[PDB]
Amino acid sequence: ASLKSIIRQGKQTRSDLKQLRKSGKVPAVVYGYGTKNVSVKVDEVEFIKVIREVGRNGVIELGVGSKTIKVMVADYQFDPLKNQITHIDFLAIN
Amino acid sequence: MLLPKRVKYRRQHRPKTTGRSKGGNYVTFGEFGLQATTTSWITSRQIESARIAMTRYMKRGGKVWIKIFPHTPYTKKPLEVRMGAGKGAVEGWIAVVKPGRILFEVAGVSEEVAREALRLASHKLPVKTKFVKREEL
Amino acid sequence: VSSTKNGRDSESKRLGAKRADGQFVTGGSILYRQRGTKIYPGENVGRGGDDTLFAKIDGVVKFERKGRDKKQVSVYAVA
Amino acid sequence: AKLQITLTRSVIGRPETQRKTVEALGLKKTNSSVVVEDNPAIRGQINKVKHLVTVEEK
RNA sequence: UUAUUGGAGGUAGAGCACUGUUUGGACGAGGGGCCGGUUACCGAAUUCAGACAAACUCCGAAUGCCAAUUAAUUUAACUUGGGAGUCAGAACAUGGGUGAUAAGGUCCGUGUUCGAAAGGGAAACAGCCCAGACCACCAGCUAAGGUCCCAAAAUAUAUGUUAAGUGGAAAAGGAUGUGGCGUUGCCCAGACAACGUCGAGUGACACUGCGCCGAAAAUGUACCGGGGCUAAACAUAUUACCGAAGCUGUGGAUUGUCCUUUG
RNA sequence: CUGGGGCGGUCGCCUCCUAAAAGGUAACGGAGGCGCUCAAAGGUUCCCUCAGAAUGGUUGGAAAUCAUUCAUAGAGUGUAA
RNA sequence: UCUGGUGACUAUAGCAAGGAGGUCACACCUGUUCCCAUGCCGAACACAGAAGUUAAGCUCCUUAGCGUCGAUGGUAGUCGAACUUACGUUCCGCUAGAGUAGAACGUUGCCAGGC
Ligand SMILES: [Mg+2]
Ligand SMILES: [Mg+2]
Ligand SMILES: [Mg+2]
Ligand SMILES: [Mg+2]
Ligand SMILES: [Mg+2]
Ligand SMILES: [Mg+2]
Ligand SMILES: [Mg+2]
Ligand SMILES: [Mg+2]
Ligand SMILES: [Mg+2]
Ligand SMILES: [Mg+2]
Ligand SMILES: [Mg+2]
Ligand SMILES: [Mg+2]
Ligand SMILES: [Mg+2]
Ligand SMILES: [Mg+2]
Ligand SMILES: [Mg+2]
Ligand SMILES: [Mg+2]
Ligand SMILES: [Mg+2]
Ligand SMILES: [Mg+2]
Ligand SMILES: [Mg+2]
Ligand SMILES: [Mg+2]
Ligand SMILES: [Mg+2]
Ligand SMILES: [Mg+2]
Ligand SMILES: [Mg+2]
Ligand SMILES: [Mg+2]
Ligand SMILES: [Mg+2]
Ligand SMILES: [Mg+2]
Ligand SMILES: [Mg+2]
Ligand SMILES: [Mg+2]
Ligand SMILES: [Mg+2]
Ligand SMILES: [Mg+2]
Structure with missing residues (x-):
């Protein structure tokens, strides 16, 4: 429940999103209470291992910059061909 | 032998073929399934041959679903005719698949039986296929 | 021997809008040409016998919504 | 400030929508230049035809 | 022509709220097994989940269209009159009908070129890529494409793949062919083979790059243009050069616009 | 007219689709209608608001008609869309 | 501010549920003598009334249950460009529908009365 994050900068183009997915990274957003x-x-590889040990619906304490937020998982877009996760939405709860 | 009982227009334009699957690309009714990898038409004789070869291998065990129905009629003009004196009579009924679409779903059987039953069906379709599970996580 | 029984069509009628939003018009000019009432008349706009919308006075023309999903035309005075 | 624009690719084989923009900049033959000043309306015409011209900051 | 504003409209895509189509599962009412009813079966209704549409739409782009601004850059536009020729069109790319998701087919829309256009490249080759010839010159810079010899310019630098002359004409399928990246099994307690020995690695799955078989036609090698090539192939980066009637340089001709010394 | 010509079929007008979100746009491309009617089915002034479904109720052809609750027009609108 | 009359605004304004409120306004309510009225019915409409009541309409609170509104981020599609003939790929602009967080149990002009 100790996953790490890196804040994207402004205005990702098309190229640097697919260049980000040819690494092991996946884009994401956080929203919700107090944020x-x-x-x-x-x-991607770290995200699967956390899900497979806390379940589909569990609490993740991930860190954005300095602070850490108790975060649940809202939804995710999946590519059924070539079977990789392509977007993940995070929801803060408190 | 699948065909609709009544259609408003018997003569129709042919469907658009390029692109990706609009929807219906996750297994929901069963445990295992067969998804497509290239693009084709399926002409309602293929899914009769494929459903029979599916069934006799499983010895009437678990259930089998078909996610494809042939909705669109296509026509053909008779033998040795000049071009253009109207549009010909109907010939058969097709359904269009695009890469992603699940074709059959099976359930109620072990996994290695499901791989072999779907492998026998896959040699009767004109599209490259692939064996899939029920996704989670 | 084969033949067909579809060759008929009507002549097309040049429907649609005839002046643009923000344009100055003269006091009798046709604004919109339609079957039925896709657009209602508003201020200083008459509605013809064959549902043609036309201006009463001369001025500038404004298209604008009416309710949730209804549209109207108005003409306002000063130019 | 000022910009120098140079017609580097020729204009034949191109659509007429792009030929009329090149004339509006004031370019006449290939490798011919013009000096104008920077302006958001001038950047729009450079944006349209940017695969045919070269801009330097004068 | 662009920037900024405003507006008309229902395509692409999506979706099932209407019209039609359709797959499973439930719910119960009816007929309906029976001995009137059970249960099975039937059709209809209502719901849960999931799919289809040129003549379906609760939604809805990009672009194109109409206009207005003491906006900014450009140079056309319109009216009247005199004089014509044209009404067999073609290929390419793209959006669609027809046809067999056949034709160098046929019919519409949108662009380019040919027609009526030489020059360079594509071996040769109206329609493909570059590019628009006023005339001299034994002067220079470049485009597309190229730099072993034919034939002008790198047997150039650096990293890797391929062993099939692949390159230098094709599929479903099949396969211990070889590289790269991941997840996960059994590990020196002795596996994994072969028969206590053996003494270190051993399997599966998944995604991928190049290649192999599948591959039979008629005058003579016989689709690399030829020689020839294991790079002179392929992929990725860098620096140089060749290369046109394109652009510069020098001189000259004709016409026009300015200034005007009609120079 | 004609994917040679003949045989066959068609020749004027209206509405949809093709038609590529302005308008326009072809083919022996796909679907249908017209060659009228109305003395009120016209004008004006006042009133009214449906089909359908559900539930009850002699005739109940199941539904004719009656009451009740909902019901965006699904009704109806002389005649195709 | 409270009540009423009357206008403006894409239901964020609606629908449902729960609770309070009244002889000042409003309404149920009393009656068919008169104007007027019902394909029959003083139900409706019209008139004459003020005994009764806050039960209902109405108004004020409470709720996000249905409907409505709805980002950010990602994806589909696409103008332009560059490779190519593959049911294609790459770059750059624009940017959905569905779904999620959330909004929301109206806001406001004019007049009269009651404060
Ligand atoms: Mg779906
Ligand atoms: Mg579509
Ligand atoms: Mg179509
Ligand atoms: Mg549509
Ligand atoms: Mg003619
Ligand atoms: Mg002609
Ligand atoms: Mg041709
Ligand atoms: Mg063709
Ligand atoms: Mg054309
Ligand atoms: Mg000629
Ligand atoms: Mg020309
Ligand atoms: Mg030439
Ligand atoms: Mg040559
Ligand atoms: Mg050739
Ligand atoms: Mg020639
Ligand atoms: Mg040089
Ligand atoms: Mg070059
Ligand atoms: Mg030679
Ligand atoms: Mg040489
Ligand atoms: Mg070969
Ligand atoms: Mg091959
Ligand atoms: Mg072979
Ligand atoms: Mg031979
Ligand atoms: Mg040879
Ligand atoms: Mg020259
Ligand atoms: Mg258009
Ligand atoms: Mg149009
Ligand atoms: Mg007829
Ligand atoms: Mg009474
Ligand atoms: Mg949206």
């Missing part, structure tokens, strides 16, 4: 919209980056 603002922050768009982030998560490793």
Whole structure:
């Protein structure tokens, strides 16, 4: 429940999104209680291992910059061909 | 032998073929399934041959679903005719698949039986296929 | 021997809008040409016998919504 | 400030929508230049035809 | 022509709220097994989930269209009159009908070129890529494409793949062919083979790059243009050069616009 | 006219689709209608608001008709869309 | 501010549910003598009334249950460009529908009365 994130900068183009997915990274956003919209980056391999040990519906304490937020998972877009996760939405709860 | 009982227009334009699957690309009714990898038409004789070869291998065990129905009629003009004196009579009924679409779903059987039953069906369709599970996570 | 029984069509009628939003018009000019009432008349706009919308006075023309999903035309005075 | 624009690719084989923009800039033959000042309406015409011209900051 | 504003309209895509089509599962009412009813079966209704549409739409782009601004850059536009020729069109790319998701087919829309256009490249080759010839010159810079010899310019630098002359004409399928990247099994307690020995690695799955078989036609090698090539192939980066009637340089001709010394 | 010509079929007008979100746009491309009617089915002034479904109720052809609750027009609108 | 009359605004304004409110306004309510009225019915409409009542309409609170509104981020599609003939790829602009967080149990002009 200790996953790490990296804040994306402004205005990702088309190229640097697919260049980000040819690494092991996946784009993401966080929103909800007490926060603002922050768009982030998560490793794919690390994200699967956290889900497979806390379940589909569990609490993740991930860190954005300095602070850490208790975060649940809202939805995710999946590519059924070539079977990789392509977007993940995060929801803060408190 | 699948065909609709009544259609408003018997003579129709042919469907658009390029692109990706609009929807219906996750297994929902069963445990295992067969998804497509290239693009083709399926002409309602192929899914009769494929459903029979599906069924006799499983010895009437678990259930089998078909996610494809042939909705669109296509025509053909008779033998040795000049071009253009109207549009010919109907010939058969097709359904269009694009890469992603699930074709059959099976359930109620072990996994290695499901791989072999779907492999026998896949040699009767004109499209490259692939064996898939029920996705989670 | 084969033949067909479809060759008929009507002549097309040049429907649609005839003046643009923000344009100055003269006091009798046709604004919109339609079957039925896709657009209602508003201020200083008459509605003809064959549902043609036309201007009463001369001025500038404004298209504008009416309710949730209704549209109207008005003509306002000063130019 | 000022910009120098140079017609580097020729204009034949191109659509007439792009030929009329090149004339509006004031370019006549290939490798011919013009000096104008920077302006958001001038950047729009450079944006349209940017695969045919070369801009330097004068 | 562009920037900024405003507006008309229902395509692409999506979707099932109407019209039609359709797959499973439930719910119960009816007939309906029976001995009137059970249960099975039937059709209809209502719901849960999931799919289809040129003549379906609760939604809805990009672009194109109409206009207005003491906006900015450009140079056309319109009216009247005199004089014509044209009404067999073609290929390419793209959006669609027809046809067999056949034709160098046929019919519409949108662009380019040919027609009526030489020059360079594509071996040769109206329609493909570059590019629009006033005339001299034994002067220079470049485009597309190229730099072993034919034939002008790198047997150039650096990293890797391929062993099939692949390159230098094709599929479903099949396969211990070889590289790269991941997940996960059994590990020196002795596996994994072969028969206590053997003493270190051993399997599966998944995604991928190049290649192999599948591959039979008629005058003579016989689709690399030829020689020839294991790079002179392929992929990725860098620096140089060749290369046109394109652009510069020098001189000259004709016409026009300015200034005007009609120079 | 004609994917040679003949045989066959068609020749004027209206509405949809093709038609590529202005308008326009072809083919022996796909679907249908017209060659009228109305003395009120016209004008004006006042009133009214449906089909359908559900539930009850002699005739109940199941539904004719009656009451009740909902019901965006699904009704109806002389005649195709 | 409270009540009423009357206008403006894409239901964020609606629908449902729960609770309070009244002889000042409003309404149920009393009656068919008169104007007027019902394909029959003083139900409706019209008139004459003020005994009764806050039960209902109405108004004020409470709720996000249905409907409505709705970003950010990602994706589909696409103008332009560059490779190519593959049911294509790459770059750059624009940017959906669905879904999620959330909004929301109206806002406001004029007059009269009651404060
Ligand atoms: Mg779906
Ligand atoms: Mg579509
Ligand atoms: Mg179509
Ligand atoms: Mg449509
Ligand atoms: Mg003619
Ligand atoms: Mg002609
Ligand atoms: Mg041709
Ligand atoms: Mg063709
Ligand atoms: Mg054309
Ligand atoms: Mg000629
Ligand atoms: Mg020309
Ligand atoms: Mg030439
Ligand atoms: Mg040559
Ligand atoms: Mg050739
Ligand atoms: Mg020639
Ligand atoms: Mg040089
Ligand atoms: Mg070059
Ligand atoms: Mg030679
Ligand atoms: Mg040489
Ligand atoms: Mg070969
Ligand atoms: Mg091959
Ligand atoms: Mg072979
Ligand atoms: Mg031979
Ligand atoms: Mg040879
Ligand atoms: Mg020259
Ligand atoms: Mg258009
Ligand atoms: Mg149009
Ligand atoms: Mg007829
Ligand atoms: Mg009474
Ligand atoms: Mg949206």
